Design a protein around this ligand. Structure first.
Ligand SMILES: Nc1nc2c(c(=O)[nH]1)N[C@@H](CNc1ccc(C(=O)N[C@@H](CCC(=O)O)C(=O)O)cc1)CN2
Ligand SMILES: [Cl-]
Ligand SMILES: [Cl-]
Ligand SMILES: [Cl-]
Ligand SMILES: [Mg+2]
Ligand SMILES: [Mg+2]
Ligand SMILES: [Mg+2]
Ligand SMILES: [Mg+2]
Length: 162
């Protein structure tokens, strides 16, 4: 099964973790917990922004060009990315914008962090029809000395497809 995992500011703005305007170690812990021991698929912009393979996960980079780093697995299409994951229970797509857009139709689960921040970025999470999904978990957390903004984790499971 394919899942997307994303952190969304107001207006469903996303960007690279290393440059986003919030500081949420709690969200990074959520991301790690929900991706550990699963393959992660990302585009090249996200890969370059991380710069080092995420530990304890197979890192698959979706790029139309030949790879530039032997520490990760380079693939040229959505289908090839999925094939490279082999037989695993759950494949995690970690962005960015265009990669989420291409994988959303193949996804059956979303892990979202709804962050109470308004920001300047121009990359967005894909449009999804909320009527097609069921919320099976949600937890709000206020900001604290370690986390700059309040945020709400959510897991959604797909019920319909258009
Ligand atoms: N929900 C959540 N989803 C996301 C992001 C996020 O921001 N949070 N941002 C994008 C993914 N980018 C990264 C980049 C780096 C890390 C990262 O570095 N993670 C460490 C945890 C951080 C740490 O404590 O060292 C890890 O091992 O997973 C996580 C997501 C897309 N989806
Ligand atoms: Cl968590
Ligand atoms: Cl990307
Ligand atoms: Cl505190
Ligand atoms: Mg090589
Ligand atoms: Mg889009
Ligand atoms: Mg769309
Ligand atoms: Mg229904």
């Amino acid at each position: 099964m394919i899942s997307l995992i994303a952190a969304l500011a107001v207006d469903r703005v996303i960007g690279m973790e290393n440059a986003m305007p919030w500081n949420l170690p709690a969200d990074l812990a959520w991301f790690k917990r929900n991706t550990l021991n699963k393959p992660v698929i990302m585009g090249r912009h996200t890969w370059e922004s991380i710069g080092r393979p995420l530990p304890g996960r197979k890192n698959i980079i979706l790029s139309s060009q030949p790879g530039t780093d032997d520490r990760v697995t380079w693939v040229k299409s959505v289908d090839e990315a999925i094939a490279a994951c082999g037989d695993v229970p759950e494949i995690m797509v970690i962005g960015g914008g265009r990669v989420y857009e291409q994988f959303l139709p193949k996804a059956q689960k979303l892990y979202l962090t709804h962050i109470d921040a308004e920001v300047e970025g121009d990359t967005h999470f894909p449009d999804y029809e909320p009527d097609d999904w069921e919320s099976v978990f949600s937890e709000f957390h206020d900001a604290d000395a370690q986390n700059s903004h309040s945020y709400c984790f959510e897991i959604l499971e797909r019920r319909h497809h258009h």
